[PDB]
Each structure stands twice: as structure tokens, then as C-alpha cells.
Design an enzyme around this catalytic site. Sequence first.
Site, PDB file in Angstrom:
ATOM      1  N   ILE H  72     -24.520  42.629  42.385  1.00  0.00           N
ATOM      2  CA  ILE H  72     -24.711  43.150  41.027  1.00  0.00           C
ATOM      3  C   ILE H  72     -24.635  44.689  40.927  1.00  0.00           C
ATOM      4  CG2 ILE H  72     -25.902  41.213  39.926  1.00  0.00           C
ATOM      5  CD1 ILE H  72     -28.455  42.702  40.676  1.00  0.00           C
ATOM      6  N   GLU H  73     -25.026  45.416  41.976  1.00  0.00           N
ATOM      7  CA  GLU H  73     -24.859  46.851  42.018  1.00  0.00           C
ATOM      8  C   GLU H  73     -23.412  47.154  41.635  1.00  0.00           C
ATOM      9  OE1 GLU H  73     -27.104  46.047  46.043  1.00  0.00           O
ATOM     10  OE2 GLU H  73     -26.119  44.838  44.376  1.00  0.00           O
ATOM     11  N   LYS H  99     -31.390  40.145  37.208  1.00  0.00           N
ATOM     12  CA  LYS H  99     -30.901  38.874  37.630  1.00  0.00           C
ATOM     13  C   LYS H  99     -32.058  37.847  37.650  1.00  0.00           C
ATOM     14  CE  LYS H  99     -27.992  36.873  41.171  1.00  0.00           C
ATOM     15  NZ  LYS H  99     -27.803  36.831  42.606  1.00  0.00           N
ATOM     16  N   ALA H 162      -4.841  80.360  52.324  1.00  0.00           N
ATOM     17  CA  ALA H 162      -4.712  80.453  50.855  1.00  0.00           C
ATOM     18  C   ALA H 162      -6.010  79.847  50.302  1.00  0.00           C
ATOM     19  CB  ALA H 162      -3.530  79.676  50.369  1.00  0.00           C
ATOM     20  N   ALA H 183     -13.155  62.312  51.828  1.00  0.00           N
ATOM     21  CA  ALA H 183     -12.139  61.265  51.596  1.00  0.00           C
ATOM     22  C   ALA H 183     -10.772  61.928  51.302  1.00  0.00           C
ATOM     23  CB  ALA H 183     -12.517  60.437  50.483  1.00  0.00           C
ATOM     24  N   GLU H 185      -9.649  65.289  51.835  1.00  0.00           N
ATOM     25  CA  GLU H 185      -9.293  65.831  53.133  1.00  0.00           C
ATOM     26  C   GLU H 185      -8.488  64.796  53.950  1.00  0.00           C
ATOM     27  OE1 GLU H 185     -12.727  67.761  55.209  1.00  0.00           O
ATOM     28  OE2 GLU H 185     -12.576  69.506  53.919  1.00  0.00           O
ATOM     29  N   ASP H 193      -9.066  71.960  52.869  1.00  0.00           N
ATOM     30  CA  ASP H 193     -10.361  72.312  53.395  1.00  0.00           C
ATOM     31  C   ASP H 193     -11.296  72.485  52.219  1.00  0.00           C
ATOM     32  OD1 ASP H 193     -11.893  72.697  55.627  1.00  0.00           O
ATOM     33  OD2 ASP H 193     -11.485  74.933  55.721  1.00  0.00           O
ATOM     34  N   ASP H 208     -25.937  65.947  56.140  1.00  0.00           N
ATOM     35  CA  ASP H 208     -24.524  66.045  55.948  1.00  0.00           C
ATOM     36  C   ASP H 208     -24.190  67.157  55.058  1.00  0.00           C
ATOM     37  OD1 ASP H 208     -24.265  63.710  57.312  1.00  0.00           O
ATOM     38  OD2 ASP H 208     -24.053  62.483  55.513  1.00  0.00           O
ATOM     39  N   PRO H 214     -24.377  77.425  52.765  1.00  0.00           N
ATOM     40  CA  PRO H 214     -25.167  78.513  53.325  1.00  0.00           C
ATOM     41  C   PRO H 214     -24.424  79.781  53.628  1.00  0.00           C
ATOM     42  CG  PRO H 214     -24.629  76.953  55.059  1.00  0.00           C
ATOM     43  CD  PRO H 214     -24.240  76.312  53.710  1.00  0.00           C
TER      44      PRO H 214
END
EC number: 4.1.2.25
Lengths: 240, 247, 247, 240, 248, 246, 246, 248
Positions: H72-73, H99, H162, H183, H185, H193, H208, H214
Site C-alpha cells: 500500500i505504501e 487497510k 566546468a 542515480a 550520476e 558531479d 550519507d 560542509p
Amino acid sequence: MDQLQIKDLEMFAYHGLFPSEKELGQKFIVSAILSYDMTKAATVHYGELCQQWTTWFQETSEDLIETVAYKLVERTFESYPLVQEMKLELKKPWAPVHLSLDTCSVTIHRRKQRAFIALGSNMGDKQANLKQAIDKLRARGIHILKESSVLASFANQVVEVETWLPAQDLLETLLAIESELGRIDLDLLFVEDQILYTDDLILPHPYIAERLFVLESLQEIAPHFIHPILKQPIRNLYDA
Amino acid sequence: MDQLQIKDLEMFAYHGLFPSEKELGQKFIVSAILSYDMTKAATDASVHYGELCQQWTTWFQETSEDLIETVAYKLVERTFESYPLVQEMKLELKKPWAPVHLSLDTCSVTIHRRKQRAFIALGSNMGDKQANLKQAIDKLRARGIHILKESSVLATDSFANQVVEVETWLPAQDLLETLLAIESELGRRLIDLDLLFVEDQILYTDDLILPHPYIAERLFVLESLQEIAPHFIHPILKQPIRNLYDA
Amino acid sequence: MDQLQIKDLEMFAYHGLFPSEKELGQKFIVSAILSYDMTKAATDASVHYGELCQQWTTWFQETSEDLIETVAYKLVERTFESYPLVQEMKLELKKPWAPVHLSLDTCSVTIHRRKQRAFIALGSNMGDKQANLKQAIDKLRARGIHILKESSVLATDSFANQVVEVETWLPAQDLLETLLAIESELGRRLIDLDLLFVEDQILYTDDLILPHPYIAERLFVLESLQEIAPHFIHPILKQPIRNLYDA
Amino acid sequence: MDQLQIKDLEMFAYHGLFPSEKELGQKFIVSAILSYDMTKAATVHYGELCQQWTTWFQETSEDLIETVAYKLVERTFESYPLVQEMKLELKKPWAPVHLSLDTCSVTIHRRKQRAFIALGSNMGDKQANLKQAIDKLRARGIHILKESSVLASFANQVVEVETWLPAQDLLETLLAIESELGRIDLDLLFVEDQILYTDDLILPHPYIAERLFVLESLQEIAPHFIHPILKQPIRNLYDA
Amino acid sequence: MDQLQIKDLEMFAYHGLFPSEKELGQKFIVSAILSYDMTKAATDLDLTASVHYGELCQQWTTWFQETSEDLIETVAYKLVERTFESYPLVQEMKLELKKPWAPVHLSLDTCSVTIHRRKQRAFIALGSNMGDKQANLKQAIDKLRARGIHILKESSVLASFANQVVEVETWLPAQDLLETLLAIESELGRLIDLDLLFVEDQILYTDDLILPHPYIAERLFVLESLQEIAPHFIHPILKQPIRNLYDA
Amino acid sequence: MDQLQIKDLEMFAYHGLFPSEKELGQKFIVSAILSYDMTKAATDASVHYGELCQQWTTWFQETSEDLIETVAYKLVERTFESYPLVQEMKLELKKPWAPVHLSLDTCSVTIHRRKQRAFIALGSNMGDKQANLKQAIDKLRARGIHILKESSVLSFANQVVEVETWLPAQDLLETLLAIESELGRGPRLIDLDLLFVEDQILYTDDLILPHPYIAERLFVLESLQEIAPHFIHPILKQPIRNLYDA
Amino acid sequence: MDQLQIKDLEMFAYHGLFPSEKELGQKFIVSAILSYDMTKAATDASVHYGELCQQWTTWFQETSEDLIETVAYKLVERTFESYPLVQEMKLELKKPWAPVHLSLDTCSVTIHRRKQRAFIALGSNMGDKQANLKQAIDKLRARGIHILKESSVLSFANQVVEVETWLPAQDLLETLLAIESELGRGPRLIDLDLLFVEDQILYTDDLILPHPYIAERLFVLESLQEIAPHFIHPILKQPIRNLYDA
Amino acid sequence: MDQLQIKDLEMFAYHGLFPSEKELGQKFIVSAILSYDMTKAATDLDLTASVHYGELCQQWTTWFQETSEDLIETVAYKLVERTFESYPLVQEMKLELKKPWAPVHLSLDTCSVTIHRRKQRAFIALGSNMGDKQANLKQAIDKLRARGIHILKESSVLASFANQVVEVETWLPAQDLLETLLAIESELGRLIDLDLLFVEDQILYTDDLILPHPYIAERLFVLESLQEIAPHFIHPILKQPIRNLYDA
């Protein structure tokens, strides 16, 4: 017939078989329909009735919710003569079943009824036994509406009364009275219109139309009553 | 038989015994079931909700009564008056803010009335006999009971005798009480009214026996009964008036 | 009469016609009203909830039926078997996840049965007459119908005749069907069973007339009837067997 | 008797008097109890029944919810011969009343019943009129269970039928048939056990026990039927 | 944070403005969320670290019926105040008081008042220069206590003014805290001099109150005694420890 | 963040303070909100209800607790253990038949926990200092708190560790102290300090976050820049990396 | 903050887009949460329900609107006007009989507004500059937004004003521009800038809060330190007073 | 912010893992809160500025029944994604999919999945130094668009790398945004990049993803092109305008 109802009055008490139930108590829900003609008032109090019910309900810890539901009905009829018929549902939603359900309830239902009982005696103070019987009857809370005169080796009499006891229960309370005077002879003759055929009771009593002395005293207090089976006024049955 | 119902119509008003109640008012909830055959309306004559609710909610607020019974009965009484289609009504008036001081759901009064056909016998043997009868059948009409059919009045110091066939929603014991009230209010012999039959019903109470216990024995009552209702069946003797008359 | 009820007891199981249903199962909700006089239990004998619910929830899950009717009936049938106290039962089985694809509340089947006293007449005139009768009254017992009282069997090529008084919750038409089924399964003259009375009831249907239309005319049936039930009242003739017998 | 019920099936449609209602439509809730003996199945489909109801309900815009509720009942009996008695509540919670309430509903309730009707004719093709009547009767959906043979300046006959029409409605449909053949003579004699006394109908018909030709043809198809008032089998009444 | 909650406790009482209401009384319904860390009670099976419902419900229902107030706010505020007094476990309240028989004469579900309070750390600067400077100060911290606000930590006094700052715990929101500050000032001849410095993290800018008090980082004798009792407490605006602010 | 929720699951059990309650049992109702990012499940990974509800119900009935808290906490604790996807959980346990003798809808306890990232500094200067340190990170791992990252070990021996726990700050702290105890506590043995627990920032009697001295202890910044040089000090609003160049 | 709430008050009216709806009317349900500090009422001042519900119901039925929004907004607007105690309000209008033809519980619109304090800079360098300025503060006051504080007036004429409004930032802005219009808009006439609206801090296409140049325009800091020298810049984390000494 | 909500829309469909579920189907219930500023619609009687329920409900219910998903998600996420596509008024969603006939075999009220997404401003740095540097960049912003994330503003390119930074609007939370960055990339030979710079205000520190990225305040060519398209945007950590950061 009109009705007054109280829906789902909540009550906490200590009723149940398990001695853990008597110890913790639990919630109970009460609902009642009281029937009587309102036409006169329009042309009972709630606060009071709920208060009494709620007092009566907690005076004690009964083992069975049946027993409490019946006490309430019995006491309601004693305290509100107006009421003609009552239906009280006692619900026990915390009953220790261990399944999901909405609730388990016991509902007791009683209606005032007019009945005629025949008394006979023929050993001892023949008439003393008759009077003792109408008394024992009054003591059980059944009302004596109308009594006939008593007829002369036997003494007979008939009584018109009012009770909310179902037929079979009346009969049982009649036999209990026979016992507690040493086994007199009480017979339920009619309870209203009703007509049964059970193992312990036939209504109307199967011999009424053939017992002159019964018709006699019956015709004195109720000459116009109709025999639910023969479809005839007592007055007329007595004429043969 | 078919039914229209209005469930839980809400109404604020000021009924109650306590003077604090008449002062603040409270919520009341009304529910009713009106019965009547809908076959004709459904097939070609019927009640409207908006109006019915609107009227009930007017009659409900006209006044403050002490007892909710009295308001429930008024709504029933007038509904019958205003919608002759309706045969049977059952109206529940709920008072869920009643000043009980305990937890409950609600505490209601429900009044239930059904139209019924009845036969009432009239007799007079003093004064303007024939006018006493007329004034009785008028008092009857004035109390909202309907005159369906009326026999002719015959002479039987003679009696003027007649019997009337009527439609009323008053229960048996109540019909009787209003019958006696009418005898009173014309001087209590001036007139005699007897309830003879209310339909099929058979009662044995302290005040009323139905059918009336001497019908099969009173030629003058079968006389008039047979003229307007010869096929009606005596609920005890299980015979048509017509036949009971032939003795 | 008084009542115990269990409202909305929840139960998961696997009934249904679709094989997808027997595979996933679904929620079912059970409600019942059991009736019997509580005056004795309340005053000194009664059913227990925990057990009743526990049993129902066992019998409900024993198997997968196709039709919820069949499960409702089983619960009723066995409840009567296990709690002779109970006089009348009414059990509603709700199937709120039924694969209808529309918005509703639920779709339920409710089966309602009441114990009744009935009189059935037995006759045989071939073979071991008296054993044919015995085996009929056995088949009766084996189908759960109770033998309350049984007359003596008299000779009337003679007939062995008898009549039996019984208690059963099967409705009239169903009692009859099981009566015929028993005639079948003993060779269809081997035995005759007739339903004479089921209480007070009076039916006129294509398959069953009650009371049986020749009772007042068959001395040999009044014979045996009068021996076990002389005061029973014929619901039509409105007389005691005893009296009908005296002609 | 057992029952199958559908509680509160929701339906959107365009029923109502106001032409604004016909335009926007609104929600309707349907609930029905269908009664018949389940003992045989245990020893109708829901999805289908709801689907049909829901189709029948939206075929049109009736002015009155009564008319729709009745169509559903009528069509349910046509399509499920099993069903013996039906009770369908049609609820209109968005009715344009402008007050707070839970809902207003109309509930129509019908039961299959066995009845006996007498036919007579004495002008025209005497017997042609009799047959036309049983036909018109069949055309109205009432079932002909059993018909007697027809008796010879008049021709008579009686018919046993089955209909869910209440007595008064049967009678009306009988008079409508008399009209649409130019005013024959149809008489309701019994509808089951029932016994009425209204302005337009007396049941049983007040002259049955005194009409030899009626008892004749009645005794042929129903010698064992009991006269609800005289308490006697037709067979016996015919014998006097 | 964990929460204990009591949903829809029924209570009959006699609260309202109309005298017919005080005469009939009516049904009121209560619902509360009490918050605190249940991790100790769950883990150590520590009965003292949880609240007993039965008693909670029983008290609330006693306090609720002790009197007839005119306004339900007043009664709701009372249960909040009393709970905090009797159940020091509780850190934050929210108690809703519903009046469903309110004489509105329309259909609704209910009307309700719901009061919400949270214990907070606050700092208060005390000064005096008049009469027995010394005494004024003590009598003020006492007046403070008397109101039920708790004194957590008090700095030594800097003895021409005398000065102190106190760290306290209160559930009264900042504006009300300020008002009860001024109340004390008054019931003392207007001598003393009370200033709200911080109430935690918070920063307000309203008509009557600016938080943190806008002069802290420039008033040496306030840092002085603040660094004494909370050197590591961080100024919510300047984002530095009192300690370091004082070092200037 | 997305949420999976199970609303009012019924369960019978025997929990309670009253011996009549253990004896009789009563109904309990459970509702939970598990949070986690569902974007990944929705697009190609997720929880079952069949199972989640079955286990909760097993766990809930294994024993009879006096406090419903201890039970509601059991389910949160266990769930995080068996479903590492879950990041935050809120589980409410309702006791509609509680023996209060008044009318109410219900009483409930609802325990709410969230996974958080923290940094703990370890020090030892007594006995086998090295060992001391290692046994602490182990004790920790034993308590279920996860070791994400550990610095190298730097008289006194120092270390700092990056961990993941659902314990609230104050409770993390208590457990730090408890370890210090069960390892024996001038010279010490161990010193656990809570340095940061995320972003959060406290000021309570028992704990201050971030710990007030970090920006001033080189040894700490040392091993802390080593495993998290980019982490931002919630107050000084700078990376550790940077605070370390000073 | 405390709250007063009226839950599901029923009201019949004729609002809607469909002409069949104006004609027939339908049921509407209203629920509101008014927030304000009750400590003062509870201790010696407050709202009535009798009245609040009566008025809402009057206001709700005066007209027939096509959108339920315009009505739900009417009640919020009016309530703030007649009950200055109220600080924040949330009013949900439910339309259970909406002509969607599907099964649902309901559709609703719920409008939520909060009183806020803001600062607006006014400038004029064309025509009667002084007048220009004054007519702007008036226009504003006309729109119901309250003038709390106005600086003295400082070629170009400048001013800054402290006000109280429940309009969200973006909407405050729109109304600023609308005033600029109805006053005619090189040389201008008026310039309204949103400087701050409380604490808040935006970054949208149409508006940035606080306004990006404040710390750099002396004229602004000038008249702004004059009426609010202690107010803290939500970003530079300093009092105006101070930013002005530069 | 204001909210439009649809409570407990009923829908029958055929979603679930078991093949018996895909065969019988079952009832699902939907409830959503759509958020946006209703002040224009209320005030200008501006039909275009509100959402039509009837249609909302009708669409949702179409999209809901187009297919049988396993989870259902997946279906809930679809309605969210589609609503945003079709109703640009909407700024924030929360849609709950219930549900209640879930084959759990126990009593409960329901199980439900509830997905919640909010449009956000984000900045993304693009670099390339390999093949047709130039081209890579364009094809990336395009891939970006293709996914339905919106390009609000793109800086000029700084032409051995560039470089470009783009301002976009997306409802995907930061972690998912990053994943769809990676994805792209990939579906490009790993050249390009992509770096998430900010997503609004937000600041994360996860395995991740660190936000803001930073290194911003030290990378001149990132400020360069950032100051070009959002000079006033404020670094959520350093608390200064890009503009000024660039001036160093």
C-alpha cells in the site's frame, strides 16, 4: 402502552462468582423500560429512580447478575405501584471472558397479571387453613384483589389476585405454600387470558367448568370474566 | 404496514419541574415512527419531512411544560389531527440533560397510540331525549374522536337509544374515562354512554369489560348495531351482529 | 421470559464460497439471545459467558464452511444440545468483510429456533410392526428431537398404532421433512409417521396442514392421544382430547 | 423464520420533489431484512443482491423515496422466489429539512400470503370473462396456485393465489380488474388466517358459509382449509 | 517524553455564571495528558516513579467538587495547580475541561477550556537600596516561595544597592511570572527590585517583557552572581556561557 | 518521515498492581506509530502487520507485569531490536478496565522514543587503562546501544566514540554512570562523558549538552575530529575540524 | 497558551459553487480553537460560548458564498475584530454533504491565523512626501492592521512603523503592494518594505525576512532603534540599538 | 498555513502481497491533509486558487484503482506524487492509507501507512571535466527535470572543470534527493558531479549526507555561481548571506 426508559446508567459494584471479582469490583450498565399508561399524567422521577436503583444495586455482592437484576425489578414494583410491566437489562462489559465482544447482558422481564386461585381444605380447623393461605400469599407480595365468601366434609373459596410472577413461578410459589403448611389445596385457575400446557401446569385449570363449588365462588367475584377456552362468562358456565 | 420515521430530531426548550430548568432550558431529542399504508403514494397521499419536523419543533416550543409526557402527548395528539393519513404513531422524547447526577445515556418517555374502530351505545330517558344524544355525539366529536357511522335513534317512560361507530386513538381505558367525563358534564337519567367494542379487543379490568357483557342479550343494542354493522364479528361469540340479532 | 445475550463476539475464521476466502479468512461477528426463565437461578440453573463464548468460538473454527448459514445453524444446534436449560435461541452471524464491493455496514444471517411440544402418530402394518415403531422413535431421538412421553402401542391385516409426545426446535415444515426422511430410510406399509399438533400452531401450507385434519375422526389416534395428553386442547375445536375422545 | 440482512448499503442517486435535488443528487442509505427458512441451505448472494439493488435504485429519478423503496421490494420478490417476507428501510440523511437530526427514513414491509378469490360472470361469453380475469390477475404478478373447475344463468369458480399485496391492496387491484373489463365479479374470500373489518373490505367474505356454489369450488381445491371464524374445514361447511 | 493520560473522566458539579446553573449543576468531562520520563518506572519496576490513576482520578474529582466556581477556567487551572503540588513527578500538564451541557441553545459537540503548563528553569535578579536592604531581599525570595514557585539555587548577596540572583523552577508562563514579580514588588511598598533574566531558552519581545533581559551582558554584578550559580548556562541570544560573558 | 501505524489492537493479559488483577486479567488496547522513510519501499524494505501484530501480542503476553509502563516499554525496546528500519516509535497502552471506579473513556500510558546519534568520551588512568576503555565500549554494546565509530586511543588514556541510541539524554547518562559503577568508581578507571546527542541542547541538574568543556579540551577535539570532523557544535555553530585548529 | 474550543457546532446555510446548492442549502459543521492566556481569568477577562456561538452562527448565515473558504475566513477575521483577547485562532469548516458522490466522512477547510508583531519602513520622495507617508499609515489602519508604534519622520522622507497583524507574511506583503497601488506606483510616492515579522525568517520568491538590507541602511536603523532599540535581529542575533552603533 | 482535508474516503481495490488478496480485493480508506494559503481564494473569490474536492476525490479514486500494487505504501506514494503534479497550489501533503481488512487475525481498529511530503527550495552544484563538459551539465539538469524536480533558477556556467549551481523545488526529502542525485550520476557513466548544497534551512548530519554541504564557505567557484542566483540566501549555519560569504 407508554413507556419510561432509562438507557445505560452506569454502576460500579462487586458482583461475580470469582472471589477476585468480589474483591476488585467492576463496571455494570443498567437499562430499563417501565410501562404504564401516561395519558393521565400527560393531561415517576428519574433522579430518584436512578438513585434508588443505584443504591439497591450496591447494597451487596451477589454471585449472579441475574439475582441483582431480579432484585431491582421486584423492588421497583414494590415502590412504584404505577408501573405495570418492567424490562431491565443488566450488562457486564468487563466480564472475564477473554475474547473481544461488546458485552454480555442478562435481561429480566415481568408484567403484572390478574389471576384466580382456588383454595380448599378438609382436615384441621378447615377454615383456619384457608385464612392462613390468603395470608401466606399476601406475605409473598402477591396482592389480594377480591375474595369470595367461603363454602361449607370440605371448605372452599376463590381469590382474585395480582402478581408479576410468570404462571409457572406462581405455581411454584403456590406449592411452596402447601408445603409450609404441611401439604390445604391451592390451584391456579386462570392467569388472565393465558393458556398453557406444560408438564407442571395446565391453564386454565382443566376442571373448572365441571366444579359447581368453584364456579359458585368464582361467579360471586367475577361473573363476567371470560373463560379463555370455552369462550363463556363464568356466570353462564355456572348456570349449567 | 409501512412507516415513516424521523430519528433523533434535536430541539431546545424549557420544559421541566424544577424552576431552574424553565429558566435555562436544555436539549431534547425527538424520534418518531408514523405508520400508514404507502402503497398508494408509491404507485401513483404522504407526509413531508421538512414540514413535519418544522411543525413538531413549533409545537414543542410553544410553551414550557412541567412534564415531558405532556409535550410528547401533545405532539402525538396534533400530529394525528393534522395528518389524517397516519394510522399509528409512536413518539419518543429523550431528555439527556436531565438533572440526575449519574452517568447514563438518556432518560426518555415514549407515548404510542393507534387509531381503532369502536362502537359506543347512547341512551336517554329524561329531558329532550333526542338532543341529549346529539350533544353527547358532539362532545365526542369535540374531543377529537371521529364519528364514522351512526344508527338511527329509536324509542324503547321510554328510552331514546342509538349506537355510534367511531374512530379513536385513545386506548380502551381512556376512551371510557372520557365517556364518563361526558356523562358528567351533561349532569350524569340524562345520558348513558357504553363502550361496546373497541375492535377485536377483549379486556377484563377493574373499570372496563370488553366487549360489554350484555350485548348479546339486549335486543335494542343489537337493533342499532345490526343496522350499521351487521357483519362485524362479536370477538367472543365469534358471530356476526346480524346473526346475534336474529335471536 | 428472560434472556442472556452475547453481543458482537468477534471471531476470525475461513468460511466462504470463494476459494480466496478459505485461503485468507476474515472477521466475523456473532450475537445471540438465549431465552429461559431466570427466576429460579436468581432466587436460590444458568449459563456461563466465558464458556459459552469459548465453545462458540471453538465450534465456529472447527472447519470452513461454504455458507455462513451452515455455521450459524451449527452453533444454534449445539448450543441447544449442550445447555438444555435454554428454550429459544436467536443467533446472528455478521460477515462485515464480505467481498461485496460497495459501502455498507454489514451483511448477516440470523437463525432463530424455539423448543416446542409436538405430537406425532406412528403406524405399521407389515414386518415386525412393533419394532418398526421402536426404530422410528429411535431415529427421532438420534436426530436430537426429545421423546417426552409415549403412549402404549395398540393393535388396530392389523395396525400397530402409537403416538408420541416430543420436544423439538425444528420448525413445523422442517419436523415434517425429517419425519418423511425417516419413513424413507426405513423403506417408505412399513411405517407412517404423522405430525398431529405442534403446540397451539395452526398452518395450512402446500406440504403440511396443522393440526392434522383427521384427528377428531380417528378413534385410534384419540385413543393414544387421550392416554398421554387428555387435557391438551385441540387448537381448532377448542376442546380437550379427553372430550373429543368420548365420541 | 430465519433472516438475511443488509445493513446500511450506501447509494447515490437523484430522487426528490425539488428539481434542485434531481439536479445534484444526494446520499441514500438502504437496509433490508429478507425472511425465509435457511434450514435447507444450512444443511441468496450478497454481492449480487447489493449490485442489483444498487442498479435498480439508480435507473431513474423518482419524486418519492416511497416509490423507490417499493420498486426494490417488488423486484426483489420477482427475482428471488425464495424470499417470503421483506422489510426495506430507505434512509435520506441529506433531506433538506433545516434542522439537526440523525435521519428520515421510509420503510416499506411486505409478506407473501395465500388468498382465495371467487370469480363470477353472467353476461357476455360467460366463461371468456372468467379466463380473462385469471389472466389479468397473473399479469399483475399475483401467482395462481390452484384453480377450480368452473360451474354452470351464471358461471362461477374459485382460485387460490399467492401475493405479497396487503389485503386492502389486493382488493383495490381486484376492483381495478373489474374496471378494466367494463365492471365479472371478483370477491376476496380469505387471505390466510387474516380477519379484517374496514370500510372497504370484510375478511373473510361475510357470505361464504351460505353460498353453496362457493363452498363447492372451494371444497375442490381446499377441502381442509379452516374458516378463520367458524373454525371449520371447508369440507364440513359444504356438507350443510 | 512519555505521557500518562486520563481520557473523558465524568464529573458532576455546580460550576457556571448563571445562578440556575449553580442550582442544578451539570455534567463536566475532564481529559489530561501528564508528561514525564517513564523510563525509570518501566525498568526498575519503580512504583514511586509512576502516578496512580485511581488516585489521580479520585483527587481530581474531589478538588473538582469542593466548590462552585463561576468560570470553568478557574476550576481547570485549580486541578493543574494542585496536580503539580501533589505529584512532583509531573513535568508538563495539559488538562481539558469540557462543558457539554453549556446553555448554548444550538447543536454542537462540546465547549471546552484547556489549560497547558510546563515546569521551567528561570533566573531572577533581586536588588535593594532602602531600609534594611538585606531583609527586603530575604522577604522577597520568601514571598516567591510562598506563591509556590521553587528556589533551586540562590547566589550570595553583593552588599548603595544590595544584589542577588536566584535560580527557580516554575510552571507559570513568562508573562505571568512577570506579573507575579510585580505583585510582590507591590505588596512590599514598590526597596525591592525584581527582574526576570531568563526563563530557559526562551526569547520574547512583548510589550511588558523582553527575554532574555536586555542588559545582562553589560551588567557586571549580574554576571557576578549569575556566574556563581550557573556558570555554564548559555545566553540564548549571545550563544555563550555566563562564565565567559563574565570574564569580560 | 512516513509512518506505519497499528490502531487499537486488543490484547488480553494479566498485568496490574492488584493481585485480583493478575488473577482475572483484563482487556488492553495498543496503538503505535512507527516512523521511517517509506520512499524506498514505495518505489522498488518495509514492515508486516501480520507479523508485527503477532509478535507484539506474543511479547505482551509472555509475562504479567505490575506496571503497564514496563510492558509498553518492552514492546518499544523489542521492536527497535527486531526491526532496524524503524527510527522513531510511539506506542500507547490503554487500560480501559482499570479498577478506577469512576466513569471515563480510558487511562493510558504512551512511551515515545527516537534513534539518536551521540558522542561519548572515555578516559582511564588506573590499572590496565587500555583494557578499562575497551570494557566500557563493550558494556555499552551489551546494553544494546550501537557503536558506530570509534577513535583511536590517545598518565591518562583517552578515546571518543560515536554511537546510536534511542535512550533519551538523561537516561543515556544514567546508563553511563551505571557502567562506571559496574567497573568500580585522583586516579579512576573510567570516565564516561556525554559530549553531544545530536543537535540537542540541555541544561538540567544532572546533565548539560553539549558538555560545557569540549571546545577547550584538545584531547577530546583530537579524537573527535578524527571520527567526525564535520559535525557541527550545536552552540558554537562550527565544525569540530575547526574548533580543533585552536 | 490556553485554548477555548467549540467542537462541531452545526449550522445550516446556503454556501456552494452549484446553483442547486444555493437553492437547497446543506449542513455545515464548525470547530474552532481560540488561543489566549487564561491565567488571568482563572485567578481573579474571558469569552462566552452562548455569544461566541450565536454570533458565529449569525455571521455564517448573513450571506451565501460560493467558496466555504471565504466564509471560514470571515469568521476568523470577525472574531479577531470583536474579541481582542484572542491571539491565535484555528477554525475548521466541514461540509459533510458536499456533492462528491463517493463515501467519505467529510471535507473540510480549516483556516489558521496568529497575531504577529511586524516592522514596516515607509519612504517618499515625490509630491507631498510627508502626506504620502501619513496616508499609507492610514490605509494600513483602515485594512484593520493595528499601528503600535510609529517613529518620527526623517530628497526622500523616511519612517518606520511597528504594527500588529494576523496576516501571514506573504499576505501582509501583498497588502503593502496593494496600498502602493491605490496611492499610484527614479522618484516614487511610497515604498513600503516588510522589515521583520517577529522572529520569522523567510526565503521566497516574493519576500525575504528579515529584509536583506536592514543592517546596512542607517535611515532605517535610525527610526527603528527609536521605537524598538531592544528588538533582536533574528539573524544577526543582535539588538537594533547595537547594529545602529555602526 | 491553511489546510484542505479529505477524511475517510472509501475505495475498493485489489492491492496486497497475497495472490488471494489480488483476487478478492478489499476496502481501503483514504484521508489527506493538503496545505496551502487559502487567503487569496477566500478573499478574491478566486476559484482557481482552491482545490475542487469532487475532482480531487474522483482522481484519487481513479489512480487508486488503476492497478494492483503489492504494497500500500507504493499506492499511497503514487497519489502524493500525482497530486503534486496536478495541483500546483498544494505546498505540503500528508495522505494516510488505511487497510482495515488486513489479514491480521486479531481485533484492531486498523493498519495504516501514511506518507508526508513538503515542497522545498534546494541548491545543487554541478561540475564536469571529461568528454563534452558543457553537454554533461545540460543533460544532468535535464535528467533532473525528467524526474519531475523543478528548475527554478540556473547560474551561468564557469568554464580542467566546468561548473554550475542550480536552484530547484522538490518535495523529496533530503536523503531521497541525494539518492536520486547519485542515480543520475550513474545513468551517465559515474563526467558529472552532483552535490547537494542546501535544502532550505535544514541541517543534517547522517551517514550519507551532511547539510549544508560542509565546504561551501571555502569554495570560491561555488559562492561565485551561488551569489549569482541567490545572493541573499542565508547559510543556515554561518548565519550570513551568500553575497557576503563570497565577498571573502
